[PDB]
């Protein structure tokens, strides 16, 4: 590579996520004053276990679709063979969400948006798995000590799905040339913008590993309590992702066909 061909890159990732990053941080901001009444919180957990479970399957799915976008509009990732592709989003995007999730989160009251308001980790009590709640809750403030910028997350978030040690793919050595040019990409930015230190400051791997983990863990919990349910009720997409074997159906395969 060269200094104009990585300066381009940073551009290039930063323009990508600009036009997938789901809802505008400007947008999330505005709303930290709209905040759910102490009667709205009985509300949600007076809810059922499933209803809870359904609504909040239905919000990861619609997040991961735009991570998908994003991949698609990465460079160099639709120039990968269809399984390595495959390979980064199953492993990745719900990575790619978690670490979004945290410009979603406000520190000041320990608060998540949640369909159109905000609310604490009380609000999910319905849910029946309060250790992943708080697992997310504790991620989500941590990365928000940080204080991570748009082009930063954009950056970031590009080399978490484009990792070469990413079991079962094919052309390990074309991911692991993609991943050096993002990693430079990442690293000038940060140097330009005297941001180094950050760095060490970073979640390790193995955190976001766990709370996918976690995730999955719980889901099949719920699944033996209900599983007509994860049948009918959950998205097509976010069974194939999580749910055992829902991996029958490759509703990913489409979304990355078309465009
Ligand atoms: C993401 C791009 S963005 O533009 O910043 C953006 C856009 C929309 C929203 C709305 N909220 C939302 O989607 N929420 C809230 C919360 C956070 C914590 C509690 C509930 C949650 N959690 C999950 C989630 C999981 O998030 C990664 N991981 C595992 N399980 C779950 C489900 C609770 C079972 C999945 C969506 C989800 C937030 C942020
Ligand atoms: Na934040």
Redesign the pocket.
Same mark, same amino acid.
């Given at each position: 590579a060269s200094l104009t061909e990585i300066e381009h890159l940073v551009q290039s990732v930063c323009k990508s996520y600009r036009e997938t990053?789901? =809802?505008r941080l400007e947008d =999330?901001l505005r709303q930290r004053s709209n905040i759910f009444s102490r009667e709205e919180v009985t509300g949600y957990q007076r809810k059922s276990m499933w209803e809870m479970?359904e609504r909040?399957?239905h919000? =990861?799915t !619609?997040?991961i679709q735009?991570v998908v976008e994003f991949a698609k509009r990465l460079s160099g990732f639709m120039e990968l063979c269809q399984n390595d592709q495959i390979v980064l989003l199953k492993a990745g995007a719900?990575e790619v969400? *978690?670490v979004?999730?945290c410009?979603?989160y406000n520190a000041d009251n320990r608060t998540? &948006?949640? !369909?159109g308001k905000y609310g604490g980790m009380e609000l &999910?009590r319905a *849910?029946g798995?309060s250790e992943?709640?708080s697992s997310? &809750?504790d991620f989500?403030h941590s990365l928000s000590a940080l204080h991570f910028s748009e082009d930063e997350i954009a950056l970031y978030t590009a080399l978490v799905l484009i990792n070469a040690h990413r079991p079962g793919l094919q052309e390990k050595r074309k991911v692991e040339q993609l991943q050096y040019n993002l990693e430079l990409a990442f690293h000038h930015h940060l140097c330009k913008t005297h941001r180094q230190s950050i760095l060490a400051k970073l979640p390790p791997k193995g955190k976001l590993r766990s =709370?996918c983990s976690q995730?999955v863990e719980?889901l099949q919990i719920f699944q033996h309590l209900h599983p007509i349910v994860v049948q009918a009720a959950f998205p097509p997409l976010y069974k194939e992702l999580f749910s055992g074997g829902g991996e029958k159906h490759k509703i990913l395969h489409r979304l990355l066909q078309d465009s």
């Open positions: 990053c789901q =809802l =999330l479970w909040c399957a919000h =990861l !619609e997040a735009y719900m969400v *978690l979004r999730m410009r979603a998540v &948006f949640f !369909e &999910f *849910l798995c992943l709640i997310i &809750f989500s =709370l995730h719980r």
